[PDB]
Write a protein that binds this ligand. Sequence first.
Ligand code: SF4
Length: 551
Amino acid sequence: MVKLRDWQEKLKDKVIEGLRNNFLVALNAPTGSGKTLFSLLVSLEVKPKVLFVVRTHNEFYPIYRDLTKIREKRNITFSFLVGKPSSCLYAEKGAESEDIPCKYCELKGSIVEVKTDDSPLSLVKKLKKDGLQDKFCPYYSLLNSLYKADVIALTYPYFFIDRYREFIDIDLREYMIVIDEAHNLDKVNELEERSLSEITIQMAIKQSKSEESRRILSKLLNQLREVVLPDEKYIKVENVPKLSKEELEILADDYEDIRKDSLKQGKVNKIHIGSILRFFSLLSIGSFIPFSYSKRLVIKNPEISYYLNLLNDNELSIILMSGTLPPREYMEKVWGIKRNMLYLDVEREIQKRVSGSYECYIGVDVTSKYDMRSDNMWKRYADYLLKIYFQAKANVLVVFPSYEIMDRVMSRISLPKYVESEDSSVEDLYSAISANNKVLIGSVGKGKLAEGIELRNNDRSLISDVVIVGIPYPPPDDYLKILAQRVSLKMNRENEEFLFKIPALVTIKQAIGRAIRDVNDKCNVWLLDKRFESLYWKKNLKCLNANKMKL
Ligand code: SF4
């Protein structure tokens, strides 16, 4: 401990004791408020070791830094694991973990002792260089270092996906478990969801080394065109193309050939047929449902509880934290958490905000509701964006309900803009808004755009205005209907909050949090949908003083 913030000082004992009484602790504290140091500090008082489960590798550094300025009368070593398409000496970007043919590698068993005497990401760069020279595998070296460390940091999949959790060699019962940005627990299923697309099959056919393989692929391609639609919503598919045990063996042979060869050229690229094979094997497990989505066949498990049941294990001490945790009742019915839980809200505890503030504007002459959407509505929305852009002190972050709506609106704008997409990366974003001055950033609520980085320059937010076009509600498609039934919740007024409002609120609050972090930050938030004027939204988005506006 070294000078704690007011909230940290007031909750430390409460949390430590709570964890000792076997309660799962849910901590609602804004990102950047010191929850990482807090969790580290309390965890060490509860158990001998600590496991941090985070969204990305970028969250590794603060843990590393906090630990080296923490006080403990004993040695505490830290270690971490980065993905294998990230630590493999012969992996090129785009390579899937399963695509790395470690079997045929002469480094599969060659490891060296690893010491985190430098920032995690820097250490990885060093291991890859020393690994090529000294002849050793960085991945296996890091993997092997885990069980000896006192504090370890891993990404979500290694905790929630069995296939990856098995790779790890730790008891778990001896670790205090800290799950960061826990609002993401709703999307754990995305961690193993498989997809099948026409583009992937063609690339598989182009990368093939077997015509007999290209044969089966060509056929699969035609059948796929009949079970997918462009609709940006999940439509259940009952007639998934079939692949016999024999056809699969033929495809598997082509996969093996490519893998072995790529490792020979020391260049492991994404092997397309691989995702195809993985799609069908997962489809056989039985827990997944196939759906059409944006011209692709996607398989996913609608039951959120499927991945979180591990959180109910009484032999595990757990802290879940985020700036926007859903309410307790939601964690019970939707996440399926049944064990005793202590739910703390940092700001409510210190009776003051620890996050920035904002002026709010509600547009009441627009809406994204189905009954009014038209080309004219999209034009009104584009006009709002221009108006907001012109008066913005800096960059403008726009959150759309879907890629379809973002396109209908953004396509009408000639101002400097950066539109999110599958290729969109962190540096591309940070760059764009660093080569055009004020930029209109187009993003879709379904995340998939940085979120694990701070858009600040010279210690000041790069985002002056956050715009919410319509309400980012999840569509009432087949995926949500099944998710609802798996939890015994009918599609009714009563359950609208749990099924539609809470995830929408999470999306909006996270976007806003992207423009503010410190108590000193200030921004404008434009809620562009007449529906936002209702007290429910003003109360929950904390803008009871919002300004009403038109045009
Ligand atoms: S260097 Fe070799 S053993 Fe290590 S992850 Fe790459 S292929 Fe696998």
